[PDB]
RNA sequence: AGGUUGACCUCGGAUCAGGUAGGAGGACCCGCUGAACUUAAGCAUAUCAAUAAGCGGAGGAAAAGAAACCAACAGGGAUUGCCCUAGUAACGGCGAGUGAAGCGGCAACAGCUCAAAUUUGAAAGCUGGCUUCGGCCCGCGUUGUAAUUUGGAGAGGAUGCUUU
RNA sequence: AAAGCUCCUUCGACGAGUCGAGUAGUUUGGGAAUGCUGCUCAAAAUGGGAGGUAAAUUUCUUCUAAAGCUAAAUACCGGCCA
């Protein structure tokens, strides 16, 4: 998977 | 986000895909008039990093202007002074198309504030700009404090004064030593190193 | 023509933020 | 060498109005003072080392303070312009000399503040209390916080017993062979890859 | 699945037996990257 | 209307002290916007993908197949740009997808998915690798068939 | 950090002060390649193809004339390590396509 | 009823509801365009001059401005202006001539906002209309309006204190 | 509810017919090192620009363009008051 950024949770 | 990959795509401009597109919107554009307004914006992930906003008091006026050089208007094409060594095809005009552009499309809306402009499509004869405006009399730009600086009346017409990102690209507003002589300004530069000061105890 | 007044202090929700955690202070200096 | 082959006389721009100009810059600096009252009329500045070897040896002030001298000194970047700290984010520390005489000067600014409360009714923990906050105050930190010592020292006295030997083979010869080095740096490391290559073929 | 009318040739524009090499119209048509096409088609399809 | 009741219900909750998540249940919904769903595709969170046929410009979404493709979601090109808008609430929508539904749905979503497979991708697999276009005019189609008979005649 | 020397001429001048490691600043992470944007211009090349001139370089290199890849680069891009860098990413394009043909 | 009934997109009309632009002034300011007399013995490089005339556009100042900077130092640190650098580096038929910038001292000092991220457990945003002033509608908008982030970082974590 | 401080495995998107090159005109002290515009070509990802003599190779130093706002110190043969 291609993440932007790191999410919370 | 797709706006990512419209750009990496837009860099292509080459490919066969954007070179299909760029042919069929140029006859498009055209067969329109010379200044017409766009419902959106054609190049959306340009309109949006150059400031564009899906609100009420942003328009979209696509424009094309023709290319080339000056021309001098003197009869017969001729100067009577001393010589030249040059023809008037080679005169070259200080401005950008751009700004042309940009002027012709704020005297066609003389109650917005041009915003910026981009190059969207060109042939032999023409280059074809979309600009983009802002209504200062709107409420929903007069509430914004991130546009609403354009609704003082320092930013009237500023594209007529070079206010405009190829506006300064053509004043040549850039820090160092390449951009000595035009940094502050040409002529104030100029008028500063030839003004004679003389102090009272000189 | 002129901006209200209350348009010409909208100010963003950052700018508030920061505005109400760091305002300018009165401050002195021992001599 | 007279440049007056232009039209010099509509550009010649006298200064009568000099001690005009000082008395509203006297008054406009009146107001600002008046203004800012109890605070001093200007920031806090560090002390930097001008560039160039024509002016590498005289100390001045700079712009403001760097993130790691106020990190080291232990003031938040936000409450630093907030308090009469001027803050540059371009500047670096690339020596310790230059950081450690800034964060002491960061440290005597902050132990000479006197930070009044928000709000009078309800002092706070980083608050100066009332009975501490009447002192005798400084308005100007371009004069309590000035460059102390601008030069080095031009004169100092050492006993006969410690005075140094020197360079081996004396000063001026000694900048004769840093010269000679500094211009055969890259002949005599060529002839290295030779003498090198030369002993890897016929070894 | 509904398709639209289709034309009598499908493929890319190609003129494959033209000797010249000036020019981006020349370049695209008379040079031959089928090879270069179906091996990068292949390893993608490989990777999928 | 129906996100003004569950904001009151909710309200009310809070007044008498519970969260809200104890009247409120898991949205199950269409995702929609075209950022959003790329994202989620990116992040391979999207079940179903359906992209509209018409969006001017067409560059907004003719990266779509080849990232839907590249990421292993199913997709499939509808008509209607405004069909979607419709199922949106909205005027338009460019594209619109599913990650996950409920449980009564999940078995009517899995043969939505095999059906849209088995019908849509492996009929369209040659076929999106041809030029469209290149069409005649009536006129030249004639001139055409007129000129290829007389040579056959002749 | 080398330490100066302490003299004003020769290898290393300078006044001799005792020098800081700095962490790297954030405006100098410019030109790092991030994932997504490997990612997002591998699918925008593979959807658009190639350039005309790209083409013609391609069929050079493939024939084997490297020089003139070279020389043919620099003319259309303007200069030699343009020309350098565009020769090496079509080698690796090929170097691909031989990889899985 | 489907030969119908609609949803969109684009393009129009209206003395439609509400708005705005033009002209003047132009000493100073931002641009465009642009001479010749003069000075070179004369004279097509040049000089006058990146000036006068002409054209467009602002304000009480304008402009510029928070480095794709200067530097090469033990490094300075947005912009502007004064002194100095300096008639210096440099450019120049057949030579008449032209001519900056870094550093340094001072006046004044002030910093920031977007695009590129999924709010996705809820477009949370906004123009207008009617109001009993509680709100309710017609819409804009997902081809993206709020919050968050802007490189000085930030996002995610950990962690324990402070702030409004 | 927001906000600040300390540390960190990891992540860390950053502006294209633009930059740049050739050529032409003009301009500059930058008639080897200047800027602007037109035509043609046309980028890249520790990449790019600059580092005032052309080029190749190996290094190093500095910033981070092609989006935007902002008082003051500065100018003032127009206007108004003194």
């Known amino acids: ?9 | 986000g797709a706006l990512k990959y419209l750009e990496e795509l837009s860099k292509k401009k080459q490919s066969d895909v954007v070179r299909f597109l760029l042919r069929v919107r140029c006859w498009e554009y055209r067969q329109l008039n010379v200044i017409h307004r766009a419902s959106r914006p054609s190049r959306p992930d340009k309109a949006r990093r150059l400031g564009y906003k899906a609100k009420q008091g942003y328009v979209i006026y696509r424009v094309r202007v023709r290319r080339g050089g000056r021309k001098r208007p003197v009869p017969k094409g001729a100067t009577y002074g001393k010589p030249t060594n040059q023809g008037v095809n080679q005169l070259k005009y200080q401005r950008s198309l751009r700004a042309t552009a940009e002027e012709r499309v704020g005297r066609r809306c003389s109650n917005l504030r041009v915003l910026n402009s981009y190059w969207v499509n060109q042939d032999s004869t023409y280059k074809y700009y979309e600009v983009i405006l802002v209504d200062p009399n709107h409420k929903a730009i007069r509430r914004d404090p991130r546009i609403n600086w354009i609704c003082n009346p320092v930013h009237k017409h500023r594209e007529c004064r070079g206010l405009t990102s190829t506006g300064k690209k053509s004043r040549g507003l850039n820090k160092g030593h390449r951009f000595n002589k035009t940094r502050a300004g040409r002529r104030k530069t100029w008028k500063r190193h030839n003004t004679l000061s003389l102090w009272r105890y000189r | 023509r002129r901006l209200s007044k209350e348009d010409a202090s909208r100010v963003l929700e950052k700018t508030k933020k920061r505005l109400t955690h760091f305002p300018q202070r009165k401050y002195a200096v021992k001599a | 060498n007279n440049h007056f082959r232009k039209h010099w006389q509509r550009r010649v721009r006298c200064h009568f109005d000099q001690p005009g100009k000082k008395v509203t810059r006297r008054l406009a600096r009146r107001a600002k003072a008046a203004a800012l009252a109890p605070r001093p009329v200007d920031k806090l500045r560090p002390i930097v080392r001008c560039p160039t070897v024509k002016y590498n040896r005289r100390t001045r002030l700079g712009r403001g303070f760097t993130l790691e001298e106020l990190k080291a000194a232990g003031i938040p970047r936000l409450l630093a312009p907030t308090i009469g700290i001027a803050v540059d984010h371009r500047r670096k520390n690339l020596s310790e000399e230059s950081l450690a005489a800034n964060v002491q000067r960061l440290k005597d600014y902050k132990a000479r503040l006197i930070l009044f409360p928000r709000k009078s009714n309800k002092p706070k923990k980083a608050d100066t209390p009332k009975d501490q906050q009447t002192a005798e105050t400084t308005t100007s930190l371009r004069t309590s916080f000035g460059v102390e010592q601008p030069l080095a020292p031009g004169f100092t006295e050492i006993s006969k017993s410690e005075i140094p030997a020197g360079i081996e083979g004396g000063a001026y010869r000694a900048l004769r062979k840093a010269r000679s080095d500094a211009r055969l740096v890259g002949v005599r490391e060529k002839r290295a890859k030779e003498k090198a290559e030369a002993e890897a073929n016929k070894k | 699945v509904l398709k639209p009318l289709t034309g009598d040739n499908t493929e890319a524009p190609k003129q494959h037996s033209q000797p010249s090499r000036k020019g981006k119209k020349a370049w695209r048509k008379n040079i031959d990257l089928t090879e270069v096409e179906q091996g990068l088609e292949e390893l993608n399809e490989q990777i999928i | 209307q129906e996100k003004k009741e569950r904001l009151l219900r909710e309200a009310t909750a809070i007044k008498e002290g519970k969260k809200k998540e104890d009247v409120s249940k898991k949205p199950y919904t269409v995702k929609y916007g075209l950022n959003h769903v790329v994202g989620l595709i990116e992040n391979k969170k999207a079940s179903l993908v359906l992209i509209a046929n018409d969006v001017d410009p067409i560059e907004l979404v003719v990266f779509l197949p080849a990232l839907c493709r590249k990421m292993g979601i199913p997709y499939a090109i509808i008509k209607g740009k405004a069909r979607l808008g419709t199922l949106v609430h909205k005027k338009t929508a460019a594209v619109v997808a599913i990650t996950e539904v409920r449980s009564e749905d999940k078995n009517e979503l899995a043969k939505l998915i095999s059906a849209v497979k088995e019908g849509y991708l492996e009929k369209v697999e040659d076929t999106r690798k041809r030029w469209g276009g290149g069409i005649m005019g009536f006129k030249a189609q004639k001139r055409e068939e007129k000129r290829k008979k007389s040579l056959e005649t002749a | 950090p080398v330490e100066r020397t302490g003299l004003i001429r020769g290898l290393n001048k300078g006044h001799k002060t005792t020098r800081r490691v700095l962490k790297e600043r954030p405006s100098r992470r410019k030109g790092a390649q991030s994932k997504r944007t490997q990612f997002v211009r591998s699918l925008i090349r593979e959807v658009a193809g190639l350039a005309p001139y790209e083409r013609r370089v391609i069929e050079l290199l493939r024939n084997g004339k490297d020089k003139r890849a070279r020389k043919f680069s620099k003319k259309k891009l303007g200069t030699f390590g343009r020309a350098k860098r565009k020769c090496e990413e079509l080698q690796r394009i090929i170097a691909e396509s031989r990889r899985a043909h």
């Open chain 1, 1 to 9: 998977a291609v993440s932007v950024r790191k999410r919370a949770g």
